[PDB]
UniProtKB/Swiss-Prot annotation:
<comment type="function">
    <text>Component of the UFM1 ribosome E3 ligase (UREL) complex, a multiprotein complex that catalyzes ufmylation of endoplasmic reticulum-docked proteins. The UREL complex plays a key role in ribosome recycling by mediating mono-ufmylation of the RPL26/uL24 subunit of the 60S ribosome following ribosome dissociation: ufmylation weakens the junction between post-termination 60S subunits and SEC61 translocons, promoting release and recycling of the large ribosomal subunit from the endoplasmic reticulum membrane.</text>
</comment>
<comment type="similarity">
    <text>Belongs to the DDRGK1 family.</text>
</comment>
<protein>
    <recommendedName>
        <fullName>DDRGK domain-containing protein 1</fullName>
    </recommendedName>
</protein>
<feature type="cross-link" description="Glycyl lysine isopeptide (Lys-Gly) (interchain with G-Cter in UFM1)">
    <location>
        <position position="60"/>
    </location>
</feature>
<comment type="subunit">
    <text>Component of the UFM1 ribosome E3 ligase (UREL) complex, composed of UFL1, DDRGK1 and CDK5RAP3. Interacts with (unphosphorylated) ERN1/IRE1-alpha; interaction is dependent on UFM1 and takes place in response to endoplasmic reticulum stress, regulating ERN1/IRE1-alpha stability. Interacts with NFKBIA. Interacts with SOX9.</text>
</comment>
<feature type="domain" description="PCI">
    <location>
        <begin position="22"/>
        <end position="66"/>
    </location>
</feature>
Length: 72
């Protein structure tokens, strides 16, 4: 359990799970943050494994989460 002003990370991840299709360009717009900033966070989380996804030649983010059983 992370301590301090930790919340944007937890809320950001939860949003991705629910969100079927999330774009990096749109992500920064909705969150206000910059595209590069948003991408950096996604790449970091995906690198550690915290999140699993793939990027296409269109620099788009595609998350594939199992609908229904939220256990693992």
């Amino acid at each position: 359990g992370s301590s301090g002003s930790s919340g944007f990370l937890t809320e950001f991840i939860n949003y991705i799970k629910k969100s079927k299709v999330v774009l990096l360009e749109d992500l920064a717009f909705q969150m206000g943050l910059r595209t590069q900033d948003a991408i950096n966070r996604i790449q970091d989380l995906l690198t550690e494994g915290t999140l699993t996804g793939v990027i296409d030649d269109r620099g788009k983010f595609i998350y594939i989460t199992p609908s229904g059983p939220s256990s693992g």
